[PDB]
């Protein structure tokens, strides 16, 4: 009987990992202090949120700028959190010398495999768990027709797994996407890929679904049963950027309560299903979120608010796990 119980201590209860993303360059922040106090008092996983991403850790094509991403890897090795890396291929801001310039197949599948096998080398064994490719299925559910895409075809996902799983056999790959909780036409055609590249060999291990959803919750049934046809593909799953964002106008203490409500539900379905490993949120104090910039009108979509104090969701989660455990 420790006076404090924290989350990661509970998680470690239910040999699961429980954690957060890091914001660019939290070490140097106004508040780094109180920041770092509670990620390591709560947490056991950190993804970096950016500087592990093409723009930072690859910034021209023969440079490569590790120096944040150890930044973050040291204060989890620090706290004895595992790190979640992220992410090693995606459609969105990549750098001018990708962007600016017209590819042909051989010459960008070059490009991705250095990339990879850089990277990944680089951190063996320090990174467990990669997400080797991120959100590459549209909002159809067609393959996104990104830069990757749209020069290699459909190759590059299998070629991207292959290569990292070749650059550090011990670590976790998982495909990442939002949008895919529960089973609708996007789930659908990401679980048919799945299924085609684990038939040729392909080692995806595990399925990361990231959680950004609002005060309306999910459908609760849908995505118990699209945990369950996941996780009997072979696969671990990884909840990767949990957020619940709500209206920033009006009733906050009402929406307060059905943050909570949605927290504890997703918390009691995932710890139904042992193929869940971990469940991280998108970050941890409201002060310090992508949501507000990206969702407008929306916010306040995390565990703790602008000044640090736990939300009516934080308590709402500890006492499922609490409960779960006894």
């Given at each position: 009987?420790?006076?404090?119980?924290?989350?990661?201590?509970?998680?470690?209860?239910?040999?699961?990992?429980?954690?957060?993303?890091?914001?660019?360059?939290?070490?140097?922040?106004?508040?780094?202090?109180?920041?770092?106090?509670?990620?390591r008092?709560?947490?056991?996983?950190?993804?970096?949120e950016?500087?592990?991403?093409?723009?930072?850790?690859?910034?021209?094509?023969?440079?490569?700028?590790?120096?944040?991403?150890?930044?973050?890897?040291?204060?989890?090795?620090?706290?004895?959190?595992?790190?979640?890396?992220?992410?090693?291929?995606?459609?969105?801001?990549?750098?001018?010398?990708?962007?600016?310039?017209?590819?042909?197949?051989?010459?960008?599948?070059?490009?991705?495999?250095?990339?990879?096998?850089?990277?990944?080398?680089?951190?063996?064994?320090?990174v467990?768990?990669?997400?080797?490719?991120?959100?590459?299925?549209?909002?159809?559910?067609?393959?996104?027709?990104?830069?990757?895409?749209?020069?290699?075809?459909?190759?590059?996902?299998?070629?991207?797994?292959?290569?990292?799983?070749?650059?550090?056999?011990?670590?976790?790959?998982?495909?990442?996407?939002?949008?895919?909780?529960?089973?609708?036409?996007?789930?659908?055609?990401?679980?048919?890929?799945?299924?085609?590249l684990?038939?040729?060999?392909?080692?995806?291990?595990?399925?990361?679904?990231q959680?950004?959803?609002?005060?309306?919750?999910?459908?609760?049934?849908?995505?118990?049963?699209?945990?369950?046809?996941?996780?009997?593909?072979?696969?671990?799953?990884?909840?990767?950027?949990?957020?619940?964002?709500?209206?920033?106008?009006?009733?906050?203490?009402?929406?307060?309560?059905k943050?909570?409500?949605?927290?504890?539900?997703?918390?009691?379905?995932?710890?139904?299903?042992?193929?869940?490993?971990?469940?991280?949120?998108?970050?941890?104090?409201?002060?310090?979120?992508?949501?507000?910039?990206?969702?407008?009108?929306?916010?306040?979509?995390?565990?703790?608010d602008?000044?640090?104090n736990?939300?009516?969701?934080?308590?709402?989660?500890?006492?499922?796990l609490?409960?779960?455990?006894?």
């Amino acid at each position: 009987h420790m006076q404090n119980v924290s989350l990661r201590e509970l998680a470690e209860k239910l040999n699961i990992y429980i954690g957060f993303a890091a914001i660019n360059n939290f070490w140097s922040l106004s508040d780094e202090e109180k920041y770092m106090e509670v990620a390591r008092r709560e947490f056991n996983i950190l993804t970096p949120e950016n500087q592990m991403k093409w723009d930072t850790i690859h910034p021209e094509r023969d440079r490569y700028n590790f120096t944040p991403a150890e930044k973050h890897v040291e204060f989890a090795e620090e706290n004895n959190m595992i790190v979640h890396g992220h992410t090693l291929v995606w459609h969105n801001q990549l750098p001018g010398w990708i962007t600016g310039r017209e590819w042909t197949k051989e010459e960008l599948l070059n490009v991705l495999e250095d990339h990879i096998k850089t990277v990944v080398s680089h951190f063996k064994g320090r990174v467990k768990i990669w997400d080797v490719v991120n959100e590459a299925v549209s909002d159809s559910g067609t393959y996104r027709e990104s830069v990757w895409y749209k020069t290699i075809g459909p190759e590059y996902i299998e070629k991207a797994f292959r290569w990292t799983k070749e650059a550090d056999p011990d670590a976790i790959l998982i495909y990442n996407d939002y949008s895919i909780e529960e089973i609708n036409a996007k789930s659908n055609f990401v679980y048919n890929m799945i299924k085609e590249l684990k038939e040729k060999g392909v080692p995806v291990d595990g399925i990361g679904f990231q959680m950004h959803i609002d005060y309306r919750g999910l459908n609760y049934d849908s995505f118990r049963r699209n945990l369950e046809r996941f996780a009997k593909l072979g696969l671990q799953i990884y909840i990767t950027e949990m957020d619940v964002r709500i209206p920033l106008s009006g009733s906050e203490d009402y929406y307060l309560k059905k943050q909570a409500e949605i927290c504890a539900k997703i918390f009691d379905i995932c710890l139904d299903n042992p193929a869940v490993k971990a469940i991280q949120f998108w970050g941890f104090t409201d002060k310090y979120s992508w949501v507000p910039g990206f969702f407008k009108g929306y916010g306040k979509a995390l565990l703790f608010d602008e000044n640090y104090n736990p939300k009516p969701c934080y308590y709402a989660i500890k006492e499922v796990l609490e409960k779960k455990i006894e």
